[PDB]
Amino acid sequence: WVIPPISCPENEKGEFPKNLVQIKSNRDKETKVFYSITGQGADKPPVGVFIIERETGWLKVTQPLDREAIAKYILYSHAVSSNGEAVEDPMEIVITVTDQNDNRPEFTQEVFEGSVAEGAVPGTSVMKVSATDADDDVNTYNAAIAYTIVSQDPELPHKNMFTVNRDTGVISVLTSGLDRESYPTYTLVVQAADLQGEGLSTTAKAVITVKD
């Protein structure tokens, strides 16, 4: 009647409800026992995410879960005999929702603005782009972002004028050739990709003005 922590992944597909664990009281030998659960996700909102079979004691989940909505449920199980007397003290059940990589990284803006002096030596820091990821950055790689440049417009004097640091999102002058007179602004297409650059991804824009 001890109960260990319980885990469920989010976004489970398939037939519902699904078994989590069978609750049991020792007093089952001396009398007939009925089981119940209380708390948010049980008898309070969100009602009915978790249910328990009153006779067998099977705790179940009734629907897919979403770790970015609710990462943890605290429930309580109850054990009542047919005479109407509690035969256990209500027992705490902790349900942890585990993560799936179901969120694309997301830039903090959709157009970032920076500027750079045409005279800047190659390897001069220009500006910083940034993305966030709603997935579990503490236990997984589902939120580990890597920045990349996708395209540059215009592609002149050539098409690698700038570079981005994949960890920090800092954009730097890659090569010399910046000519305000001949092209006054560059528009980069930047990409954030999770799983260390290898996962889901999104894009945004960075607009670079060449100063005097």
**Binding-site annotation: residue ranges for Ca(2+):** 102, 133
Measured from the CB of residue 163, what is the shortest distance to its own copies in angstroms?
25
Judged by CB under 8 A, the stretch of 38-46, 84-92, 94-102, 110-118 that binds its own copies is 94-102
Site residues (vs Ca ion, CB under 5 A): 10, 66-68, 99-103, 133, 135, 142, 194
Structure tokens at 211: 């100063």
Q: Return the amino acid letter for 73.
A: Y
Q: Examine residue 33 and tell whether it contacts its own copies (CB under 8 A).
A: no
Question: In 10 A of CB 79, how many CB atoms?
Answer: 23
Name which of 5 and 45 has its Cβ closer to its own copies.
5
Closest CA to 142 of 44, 30, 45, 11: 11
Q: Examine residue 11 and tell whether it contacts its own copies (CB under 8 A).
A: yes
Q: Residue 202's beta-bridge partner residues? A: 192
Measured from the CB of residue 193, what is the shortest distance to its own copies in angstroms?
10
Subset of 36-75 contacting its own copies (CB under 8 A) = none
Q: Return the amino acid letter for 23.
A: I
Separation between Cα atoms, residue 2 and residue 24, nearest integer Å: 9
Q: Which does 56 bind (CB under 5 to 8 A by kind): Ca ion, its own copies, none?
A: none
Separation between Cα atoms, residue 19 and residue 84, nearest integer Å: 27
